[PDB]
């Protein structure tokens, strides 16, 4: 060890460049003996107050400066004038009250900047100026309460930014004008009320868009001019509609997040045009009484849609739908069903609590890889015969309260899971035979479970 | 299959009678077992009902032969007769035992 | 000795000397000869019985029981039954009579039950019942009727049990059944009744079952008005679409009331008062039930299960009108706040899932000492005050999934055997093993949390 | 309890950090056992909320040390990084490689 600072830990980066780790030595301040050639300095949980009696700078070869954990107030603005070769710096969970209003710039070389976990509140402009390489840059869980769009103006090159955890209460339009670069933004967890319309449309590289936990009051709309965008969250906000042709703007989506927002409507075409999109979830939307359109979005593997007012569906509904695998539609207004053949590849259906009064013959036919039917509390008053001819894979069946007086036993042999209660005129007897591999029954009279070896003196109906 | 018996199972007997009989189970202990008859025993009581005609056991305190549930036809002797139920007492509406035990 | 007990057939001593003769499933052509007087029950069923008779026996004074179904029989001569003094029942069923015999049957005196369902019977001439004193039980079922015989039953008030059901009656007339004091029991099921009369059962006093089940009535029986004394009361799988106010004032000391799979939309508020004698209730559906029902002199509910409406909020002393209740499941309506609930003791299960409530105070479950199931799922419950479970010794099934949690009250609530808290995206922070012992099921929002507890007797937990 | 750590279990360990560190989870033999950081070590990456601050492993393909997931800070050598994802290839929007390998 020669040059490594007494106490420190010392390591050899490239062959001859040094790497110094003097975290968790509780200094006072940092050592005045340093080796220049030290191209990596991690100082951290070191309650360093001020820097310094002798700072170091002409450590033209440090790349990485860590200077978290410590109790900084401020920083002096010719504090890091020596580092040519500075690629990374770690100033977070300091007591910084602002960003450092000259110190940081023409560091020509910084590529990544963390200023998250301080008490920042006020960020001065051009204090980024002259970070030609900043691509990373961290402002979280600071006290921040506007954009300080002046200032993001000179970072054309950052390519991801957290702005997260923060007091921000509302987004001015083009707040990020300059950032034609940038590809990842977090804005969660913050008092975002309200948003321009024209406020995302500086960044055209942007691919995910965090605007989870917050309190928004309107669906944001500015989210149009952002063609590139794949991830997009907005959920645990205070939304109360999605407007038709919402995501218009934003094909190559990929996945969606606006759950915990107290939805009522939906756009029918709101969710149009997404190719790359693979699940929908649609839960209490009282105020939808259609069917939403999915042109050209026929990649949807998982539709759930519940808690609205859906009367029926578009007889060739399935047409749109390919590669669906399940469908769970429970809580509507149901009465006549399609022919759902079209929409193979379907493994689960949940039609529950619809006011289903009939069964058709083609309204299940080639359902080959179906496996799991709920047609519970529906008013299902006949089911034809040979409904459930052609569903080899079928496995689980639920019927449960819904007025049937008979069975078709047809097809079906064989299935796992049997449920039957509440259908009071459904009486006669079923065998065990016509029936092996019941692992659960429900039946609506104890003589029927009885039938099938249970009963005692479990199912059961009572 | 059985006596008048259109569908049974090896194990659990008569599953479905033909058009006008009752169906009675059986407890053979443990399995169910399935009758066919014109009629019910003594304890049932014939239920008719459109998909299938059964034979429904008596529960009723002491009752011999009844109607339907809730309702006694004949009651158990040391026992009194009053609107389909079986009684001690009889009440107080105003009933009373003739030279029969049928509470009036 | 023979005893001269039909040669085929099977006798044995009844009474004292009285005489018990089966000569059942014997296909016989017609009935026996000999067959000595004395014989106090006669069974002839089964029996490919054409016509009676060539040679009748009468002189049977002793004969207390007739059975003659499964015989294939057309029509009853008039003088049948004549010699027969002592005959309290008769059985006619599974034959092929049109109409119930003209005077065939009239002045049995002692008959008490006749039995003439499963024939193809669809005219009752009337007075074909006169002079029956003795009659208490009658059976009609699986026949042809289209109308009620008002006519010919108005003689029969000895009736206790009567069955029509399993006919085509579509509709019954005002007072169709007037003289019928003594009739306790009344079953009209399966038939296609569409109307009937708004004073339609004016007559039995005595009714205490009625059953009106798998018909197609289009609106409320109100006739049950003037049933005071009925006990039981059925009107299933109809297409009734209301209960009226008052429904039941008429009918205190009900005790079972079925009316499931009717598609009840509307519930009068005051329409279940003063039924003491009733146990459970359920309304499954009823949309425009806006308001929760009123209870007055009828707290002996133990189960209450309300769903599919859109109740608003409940009285702050609802509670004071269910004691005894031990089940309350009030599921998909629109509920934001909640009463106290501590009233209601005994309360065993709470089913309040798919409600918009918003906030969970300290008072609105406490001292719920029964309480074991307690179901909040997909409702918006941003905050619980901590101690609101402190106090529910009993509790060991929680669910409080697809709710808008961020922390959790774990205080009191220590080792339940159930808790769901998927779908609480806020809720981020860890559970300890210790602070939940028995925990055998277990949904965690997050799967690290899950892993807390041992997972990727035995226990479980999934994301 | 252990180093900046409020409440710890006897089976997993550190159950809440103090105010401003990550928890880092480790899981060894089906069991949890948490650790109280000041930022979380490479392959993970800081998340901040106000709940819980925690450690994410970033399972993105060939990266080293990343911002969130879904986007890579620093890509492994002999893979280039362009827009937070790693590649051999990388494009044709207008990239291409200098003496380092971030097209
Ligand atoms: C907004 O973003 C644009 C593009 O991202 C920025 O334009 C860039 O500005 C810098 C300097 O401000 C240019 O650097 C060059 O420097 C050399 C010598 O130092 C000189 O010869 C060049 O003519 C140029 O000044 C860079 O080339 C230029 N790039 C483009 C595409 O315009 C702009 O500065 C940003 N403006 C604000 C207010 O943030
Ligand atoms: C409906 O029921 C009442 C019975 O409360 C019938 O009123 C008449 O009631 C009397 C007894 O209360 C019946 O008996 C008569 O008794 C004397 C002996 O005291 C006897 O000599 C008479 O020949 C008769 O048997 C009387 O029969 C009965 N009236 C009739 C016409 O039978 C009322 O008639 C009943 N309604 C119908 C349509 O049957
Ligand atoms: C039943 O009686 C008819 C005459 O009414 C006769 O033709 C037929 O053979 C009889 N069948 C049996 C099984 O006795």
Known sequence: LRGCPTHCHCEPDGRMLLRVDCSDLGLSELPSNLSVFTSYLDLSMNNISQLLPNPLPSLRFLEELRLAGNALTYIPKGAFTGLYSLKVLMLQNNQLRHVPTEALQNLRSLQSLRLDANHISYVPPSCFSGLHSLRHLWLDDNALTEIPVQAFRSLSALQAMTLALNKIHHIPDYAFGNLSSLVVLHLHNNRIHSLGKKCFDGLHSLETLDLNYNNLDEFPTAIRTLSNLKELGFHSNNIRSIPEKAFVGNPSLITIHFYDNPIQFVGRSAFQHLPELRTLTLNGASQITEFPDLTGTANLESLT???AQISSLPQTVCNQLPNLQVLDLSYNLLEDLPSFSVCQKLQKIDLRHNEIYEIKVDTFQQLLSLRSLNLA?????????????????????????????????????????????????????????NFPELKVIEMPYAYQCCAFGVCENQCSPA | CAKGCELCSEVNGCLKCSPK?????????????????????????????????????????????????????????????????????????SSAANGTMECS
């Open chain 1, 305 to 307: 849609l519940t808690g």
């Open chain 1, 377 to 433: 509390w529906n008013k299902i008053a006949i089911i034809h015969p040979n409904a459930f001819s052609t569903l080899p894979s079928l496995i689980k069946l639920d019927l449960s309260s819904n007025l049937l007086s008979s069975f078709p036993i047809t097809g079906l042999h064989g299935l796992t899971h049997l449920k039957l209660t509440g259908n009071h005129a459904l009486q006669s007897l079923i065998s065990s035979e």
């Open chain 2, 21 to 93: 009989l009752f169906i009675l189970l059986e407890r053979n202990d443990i399995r169910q077992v399935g009758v066919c008859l014109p009629s019910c025993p003594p304890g049932y009581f014939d239920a008719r009902n459109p998909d299938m005609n059964k034979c429904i056991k008596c529960k009723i305190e002491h009752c011999e032969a009844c109607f339907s549930h809730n309702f006694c036809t004949k009651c158990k002797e040391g026992l009194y007769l009053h609107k389909g139920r079986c009684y001690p007492a009889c009440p107080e509406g």
